[PDB]
């Protein structure tokens, strides 16, 4: 579901990721997703408009927008957080990547 | 570059030209239009023409591809900008 962050049921490429695909669009076997990376790994010189910083638990995470990917639903694990309140920042990052707003 | 289709298996580069990743690029793979019936949404999966063949943009299979794998430019679909923009916006924002 849109704006919810999940865990990857596989042990290899992602820790966490944000589902950014519309809830009105059923692929149905896949889902558009943006992986999250620990905010410490990136300096604060990196655009927060293209790579917004989100908070889950007591940690900061960077949305790796440019690494968006289609992930099959059978690999989407447990719901970890709901970032609906960051809708505006997430929408802007995606729109910037495609339409250079 | 945006709206240009490349090879390695065809795909359309849909990422802004103002945004350098730089090592990767947002892309939408193309599949032969014969493989899908015409009951499949042309709004979410627009039909494009390259050469003397029809292709379906597999929007829901969008992916980040490393630039070193992007081959020869095959076509420029800039004139289909509106349909491509609508398909992407539909997938994310359910317009
Ligand atoms: Cl947050
Ligand atoms: Cl066309």
The verdict on domain B1-95 having CATH code 2.30.30.110 is: yes
Token pair recorded at residue B64: 């980040």
CB contact under 8 A, A22 and B85: no
| C-alpha–C-alpha distance, residues B9 and B86, integer Å | 24
3-state DSSP call for residue B75? strand
B65 neighbors B25 (Cβ within 8 angstroms): yes
Distances (CA, A) of A100 to A49, A86, A94, B21: 11, 20, 9, 13
Resolution to 1 decimal, in Å?
A: 2.6
CATH number for the domain running over A1-101:
2.30.30.110
Q: Shortest Cα distance from A33 to chain B (angstroms)?
A: 10
Sorted by sequence, the CB contacts under 8 Å of residue B10 that are 6+ apart come out as B29, B30, B50, B55, B74
Q: Which segments of chain A are extended strands (E)?
A: 4-8, 16-19, 30-38, 53-56, 59-63, 69-72, 76-82
Distance A2 CA to ligand 2 centre (A): 31
* A60 CA from centroid of ligand 1 (Å): 8
């Amino acid at each position: 579901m849109q704006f919810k962050v999940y865990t990857y049921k596989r042990e290899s490429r992602y820790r966490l990721f944000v589902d950014v695909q519309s809830d009105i669009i059923d692929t149905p076997g896949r889902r558009m997703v943006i992986p999250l990376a620990s905010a410490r790994l990136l300096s604060d010189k990196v655009s927060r408009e293209l790579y917004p910083v989100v908070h889950i638990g007591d940690e900061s995470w960077r949305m790796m927008t440019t690494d968006m990917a289609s992930v099959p639903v059978s690999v989407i694990g447990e719901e970890v957080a709901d970032l609906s309140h960051r809708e505006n920042d997430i929408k802007n990052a995606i729109n910037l990547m495609f339409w250079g707003i």
